[PDB]
Write a protein that binds this ligand. Structure first.
Ligand SMILES: O=C(O)c1ccc2c(c1)CCNC2
Ligand SMILES: [Cl-]
Ligand SMILES: [Cl-]
Length: 79
């Protein structure tokens, strides 16, 4: 799947970064503590560890399960 524009409306299930890393679940503060949660982004579709763009980034992204890599853009292409 691909995203349109900045991907703020992307609701797919892709969960892999541009370096092949697995996205961290949005509801998790582990390994990375953060504030991109449904509490603060109720319209963001912050579901499981799905690639999302809740904060008007240029493209969908996620926190990563690698403790040494906080966040990355997802390996999704623009439509
Ligand atoms: O972890 C953070 O403080 C943080 C800050 C800014 C941005 C992200 C994460 C994700 C991408 N959008 C900008
Ligand atoms: Cl989209
Ligand atoms: Cl920001």
């Amino acid at each position: 799947d691909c995203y349109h524009g900045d991907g703020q409306s992307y609701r797919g299930s892709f969960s892999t970064t541009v370096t092949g890393r697995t996205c961290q679940s949005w509801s998790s503060m582990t390994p990375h503590w953060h504030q991109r949660t449904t509490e603060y982004y109720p319209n963001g579709g912050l579901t499981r560890n799905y690639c999302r763009n809740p904060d008007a980034e240029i493209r969908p992204w996620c926190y990563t399960m690698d403790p040494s890599v906080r966040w990355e853009y997802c390996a999704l292409t623009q439509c």
